Amino acid sequence: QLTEEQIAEFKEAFSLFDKDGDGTITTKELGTVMRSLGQNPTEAELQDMINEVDADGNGTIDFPEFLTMMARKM
Amino acid sequence: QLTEEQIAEFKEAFSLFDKDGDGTITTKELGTVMRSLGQNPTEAELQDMINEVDADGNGTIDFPEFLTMMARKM
Ligand SMILES: C[As](C)(=O)[O-]
Ligand SMILES: C[As](C)(=O)[O-]
Ligand SMILES: [Mg+2]
Ligand SMILES: [Mg+2]
Numbered sequence: 760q761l762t763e764e765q766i767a768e769f770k771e772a773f774s775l776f777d778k779d780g781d782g783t784i785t786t787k788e789l790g791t792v793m794r795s796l797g798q799n800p801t802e803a804e805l806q807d808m809i810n811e812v813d814a815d816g817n818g819t820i821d822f823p824e825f826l827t828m829m830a831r832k833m
Numbered sequence: 834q835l836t837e838e839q840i841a842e843f844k845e846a847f848s849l850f851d852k853d854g855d856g857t858i859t860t861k862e863l864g865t866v867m868r869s870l871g872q873n874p875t876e877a878e879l880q881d882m883i884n885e886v887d888a889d890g891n892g893t894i895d896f897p898e899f900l901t902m903m904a905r906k907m
């Protein structure tokens with residue numbers, strides 16, 4: 760199970776790139792979010808993550824989908 | 834034909850509500866954009882405008898679609 764601290768940190772990093780504050784970011788910024796968390800995903804790993812969280816193909820990731828993906832990863 | 838001044842003013846008003854600067858706003862803010870231009874559309878007029886510019890139903894209006902709608906209106 761994710762801890763409160765992890766959820767908070769996932770949220771904070773995500774929100775750094777949510778410039779309009781509506782809880783969504785671009786798939787192009789997912790790598791930046793991950794590196795903001797101190798991680799270093801490969802291009803392949805990011806593509807697999809993008810396939811998971813951008814379920815509908817529109818290039819937009821919302822926080823709830825990001826978080827559950829992060830939970831699976833951990 | 835729209836003048837340069839009108840295009841510039843349409844762009845500036847639109848961009849007031851493009852908080853992440855990617856050239857799109859929400860349909861919920863279209864009325865605010867119109868009032869920023871000194872206009873006062875009715876609810877019916879806004880709904881007709883929303884039908885025009887949010888052609889795909891996703892609640893997101895981009896500048897090119899806004900501008901051509903504004904051109905038709907004028
Ligand atoms: C990433 As978005 C839906 O706030 O343009
Ligand atoms: C109105 As938008 C696509 O920048 O969230
Ligand atoms: Mg998506
Ligand atoms: Mg749309």
Ligand code: NA
Nearest residue numbers: 777779781783
């Ligand atoms: Na956003």
Ligand code: NA
Nearest residue numbers: 851853855857
């Ligand atoms: Na925007």
Ligand SMILES: [Zn+2]
Nearest residue numbers: 779781783853
């Ligand atoms: Zn947004």
Ligand SMILES: [Zn+2]
Nearest residue numbers: 820821823824
């Ligand atoms: Zn979602």
Ligand SMILES: [Zn+2]
Nearest residue numbers: 779853855857
């Ligand atoms: Zn945006």
Ligand SMILES: [Zn+2]
Nearest residue numbers: 894895897898
């Ligand atoms: Zn468009």
